[PDB]
Amino acid sequence: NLYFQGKIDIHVLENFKNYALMLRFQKLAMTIIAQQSNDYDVQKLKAAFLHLDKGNITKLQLRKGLERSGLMLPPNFDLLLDQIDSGNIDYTEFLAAAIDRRQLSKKLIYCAFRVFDVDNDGEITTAELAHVLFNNITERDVNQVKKMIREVDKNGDGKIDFYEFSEMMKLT
């Protein structure tokens, strides 16, 4: 009964749940990278935004932090800023956007990895990852994570090793 089979097809919600959690995963990872980055030109910006700040500052405050660091902003800056995020900005997200992901160093990527690999055994397991993404976690929570890693779990072992995490971060 094709009509019946279609009416009970749930793949749309599956895909969405996976996408949403993968997004959270990557944003958490980039928050750690942005914090640990040894690129001084990112660090000073981070420092400048923290002395204005929660994690949240107005876009006007972000522009000022940039300008006061010695940068000339392009005429369409505001339009570019809208693409990444009521006139306020998560500045760490800006900082993440300012880091070239294809050129991340192994050491910097490991700083992020280490945080998800809580027991430090070299594998981000479902329960470790669920912990990082949701930490009073439920059964349901752990299983949503287990489904989300399928795409980046290249060897099919149900865990994320460093190679897989790295691939995912360098977007390749």
Choose the stretch contacting a copy of itself; rule: CB under 8 A; options: 17-25, 53-61, 118-126, 153-161: 17-25
- Residue whose pair of structure tokens reads 């669920």 in the numeric block: 130
Helix (H) or strand (E) holding 159: none
Min. distance of Cβ 120 from a copy of itself in angstroms?
Answer: 27
Distances (CA, A) of 160 to 24, 70, 114, 151, 153: 16, 41, 12, 10, 6
d(CA 35, CA 19): 24
- Of 11 and 54, nearer to a copy of itself (C-beta) is 11
Q: Assess contact for 52 and 65: CB atoms under 8 A.
A: yes
Q: Is 76 annotated as a binding residue?
A: no
- If binding is defined by CB under 8 A, does position 91 make contact with a copy of itself? no
- If binding is defined by CB under 8 A, does position 7 make contact with a copy of itself? yes
Within residues 93-122, the interface with Ca ion by CB under 5 A covers: 117, 119, 121
Q: Is 117 annotated as a binding residue?
A: yes
User: Which residues, including other chains, have CB under 8 Å from residue 109's CB and lie 6 or more apart?
Assistant: 33, 162, 165, 166, 169, 170
- Of 75 and 120, nearer to a copy of itself (C-beta) is 75
Q: Is 123 annotated as a binding residue?
A: yes
Q: Assess contact for 116 and 122: CB atoms under 8 A.
A: no
Choose the stretch contacting a copy of itself; rule: CB under 8 A; options: 2-10, 104-112, 114-122, 153-161: 2-10
Determine whether 161 is exposed, middle or buried from the number of CB atoms within 10 Å of its CB (0-12, 13-18, 19+): middle
Q: Which residue is nearest to Ca ion, using beta carbons?
A: 121
The contact set with Ca ion (CB under 5 A) reads 117, 119, 121, 123, 153, 155, 157, 159
Residue ranges of the annotated binding site for Ca(2+) are: 117, 119, 121, 123, 128, 153, 155, 157, 159, 164
Residue ranges of the annotated binding site are: 117, 119, 121, 123, 128, 153, 155, 157, 159, 164
